[PDB]
Write a protein that binds this ligand. Sequence first.
Ligand SMILES: Nc1ncnc2c1ncn2[C@@H]1O[C@H](COP(=O)(O)OP(=O)(O)O)[C@@H](O)[C@H]1O
Ligand SMILES: Nc1ncnc2c1ncn2[C@@H]1O[C@H](COP(=O)(O)OP(=O)(O)O)[C@@H](O)[C@H]1O
Ligand SMILES: Nc1ncnc2c1ncn2[C@@H]1O[C@H](COP(=O)(O)O)[C@@H](O)[C@H]1O
Ligand SMILES: NC(=O)c1ncn([C@@H]2O[C@H](COP(=O)(O)O)[C@@H](O)[C@H]2O)c1N
Ligand SMILES: [Mg+2]
Length: 301
Amino acid sequence: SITKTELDGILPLVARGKVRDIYEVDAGTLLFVATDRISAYDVIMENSIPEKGILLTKLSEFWFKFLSNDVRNHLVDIAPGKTIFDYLPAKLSEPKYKTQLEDRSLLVHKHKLIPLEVIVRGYITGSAWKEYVKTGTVHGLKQPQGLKESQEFPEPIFTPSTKAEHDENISPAQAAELVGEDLSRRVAELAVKLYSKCKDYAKEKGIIIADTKFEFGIDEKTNEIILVDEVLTPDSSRFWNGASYKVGESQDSYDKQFLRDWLTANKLNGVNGVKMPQDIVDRTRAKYIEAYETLTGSKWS
Ligand SMILES: Nc1ncnc2c1ncn2[C@@H]1O[C@H](COP(=O)(O)OP(=O)(O)O)[C@@H](O)[C@H]1O
Ligand SMILES: Nc1ncnc2c1ncn2[C@@H]1O[C@H](COP(=O)(O)OP(=O)(O)O)[C@@H](O)[C@H]1O
Ligand SMILES: Nc1ncnc2c1ncn2[C@@H]1O[C@H](COP(=O)(O)O)[C@@H](O)[C@H]1O
Ligand SMILES: NC(=O)c1ncn([C@@H]2O[C@H](COP(=O)(O)O)[C@@H](O)[C@H]2O)c1N
Ligand SMILES: [Mg+2]
């Protein structure tokens, strides 16, 4: 696994997130490296999921391409026949570095981010289900009565969260407080549009995208929302098998929920330094790969 990139100062480190190591290529561009780290409940596991970051990268790329006519994205154009390494200092092609970067790195434009987790829910689960059972709303929004667990909403819904300790689910109205009324509506509508397109596509492939978290940037020069971060990965989404889908209960996970649930079941949610047993590593990895393969129609290996 590539757990922590070690680039020996060749590029400045902008950040490490839970998953990504982000370096500055230049003033406008980031080397956006998805490591193999995995986190749940905002805590990184001790051990990694080998090549998860490659999957997140590749799957993101798939979706960026799928959505390329629907939304601008943060990817830097790589000229034909070139690789990201052509756009990096030569030293990063040396194997010590290249092995840490290849297939898990995106060269992206630094964007001003819209400070929301742009969650779209097509189906009620997770935190939405928890809230709905209580008060019949999601992120404060009113809903039809009688939804059962995992049921499809009548229409997918934008249900933002803050970008945090833990992210906070907020209403669209509160999101508009944060980001502006016009922008928030644009975000909502675009997110739902993107989600729905992907949902429909995925459904035909056999996957229900229950929900997903997008991240958007804003290019204030062109007044364009930019799809940034990762897109429709099993970290950012819940993927259910359509054929096994059954409302009124939880679904099999093809996504991080498997790990989340395992941690919770084992009273390890929130605990740092958790070593996923190999079985859990493997099962998680395999679930992610299954999602990847089904969604993309391509083989992982
Ligand atoms: N194009 C971009 N420009 C700047 N920051 C970005 C861009 N795309 C994503 N990001 C940010 O890069 C980080 C990605 O790393 P990640 O490990 O996913 O972080 P997190 O732990 O917050 O989820 C996040 O802070 C994300 O918002
Ligand atoms: N214990 C918690 N209580 C409330 N919200 C949480 C909790 N843990 C994580 N979250 C939030 O749920 C979302 C998903 O987190 P999760 O994927 O499970 O951990 P990570 O975000 O590091 O991968 C994030 O917005 C995160 O901030
Ligand atoms: N912004 C980018 N960062 C890293 N790799 C990229 C980027 N854009 C394209 N690629 C890679 O270049 C190759 C051609 O991709 P594409 O032409 O976008 O289908 C693929 O292997 C991509 O992974
Ligand atoms: N901060 C995050 O990475 C994040 N925040 C939300 N999500 C995704 O948003 C969806 C809704 O999550 P929840 O039901 O826990 O609010 C799930 O697919 C979840 O993985 C994320 N990936
Ligand atoms: Mg992230």
